[PDB]
Design a protein around this ligand. Sequence first.
Ligand SMILES: CCCS(=O)(=O)Nc1ccc(F)c(-n2cc(-c3cncnc3)c3nc(N(C)C4CCN(CC)CC4)ccc32)c1F
Ligand SMILES: OC[C@H]1O[C@H](O)[C@H](O)[C@@H](O)[C@@H]1O
Length: 261
Amino acid sequence: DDWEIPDGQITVGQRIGSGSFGTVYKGKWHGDVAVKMLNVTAPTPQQLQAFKNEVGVLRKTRHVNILLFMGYSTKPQLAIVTQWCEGSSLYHHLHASETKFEMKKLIDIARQTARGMDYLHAKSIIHRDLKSNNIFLHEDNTVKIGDFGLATVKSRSGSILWMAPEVIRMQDPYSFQSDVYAFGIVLYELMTGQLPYSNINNRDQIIEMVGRGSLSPDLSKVRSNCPKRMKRLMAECLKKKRDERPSFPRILAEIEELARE
Ligand SMILES: CCCS(=O)(=O)Nc1ccc(F)c(-n2cc(-c3cncnc3)c3nc(N(C)C4CCN(CC)CC4)ccc32)c1F
Ligand SMILES: OC[C@H]1O[C@H](O)[C@H](O)[C@@H](O)[C@@H]1O
């Protein structure tokens, strides 16, 4: 219950990232921690509630593949405290760093992401923005799912590649099934090494054609050593009709089975 950290206990160190909604620092509190402070000094009334309702969501997560919530500050600023992870995100490894993981490692990353998502969904928490940027590889080995965006307040733009067709349409939207689609696009990333729609020049073009059903990822680009179970699972996860997509228990059980072989 006492997840509030009193004023003065945290030594806020180097600034690690900055956006409109928030700023993230490395800091000291019984060891290393990350501290995301919200860029709003005078808190608007019941925006504090939005901070409180998130704190009440993060408070419910205890799992090795979910970034460890550790506490929060109200004074001096509104702030959220997590564990400090050494390493970088799946997005950085795959698309910036040119990291070439072995298939065993690639499946292991897909496995651990599945575990974390399965856990979240089992607690009725919908992520809403699962993507390779939000999967941190701690020690470059352990998946730590979080939400590393500092641009916007969490809906509850640079995520369109992972958005399900119904989520792009906004006809009413976000659901377990939409999270599962995003995971589909992560498997694509892992198994091809590339972002989807690499040939398409324009975002508005991706929004239009994925929304109007006329564009989908090129599944033939998967590595020649991509298992058959995974290409099939990827395709089930990417299905246009929401209700045709599998749930995480069966996704996890399928990936755990393919890892064993
Ligand atoms: C319990 C889940 C809470 S959550 O949804 O993940 N939100 C959240 C709350 C508090 C936080 F501090 C955090 N949070 C934690 C970390 C972090 C952790 N370990 C180690 N480096 C960075 C973090 N990096 C962010 N970036 C955008 C950084 C990602 C790494 N890059 C390297 C070039 C610098 C920018 C944004 C929020 C971040 C958060 F993401
Ligand atoms: O607020 C919902 C949050 O649920 C979990 O803690 C996820 O790890 C995080 O990414 C998400 O933002």
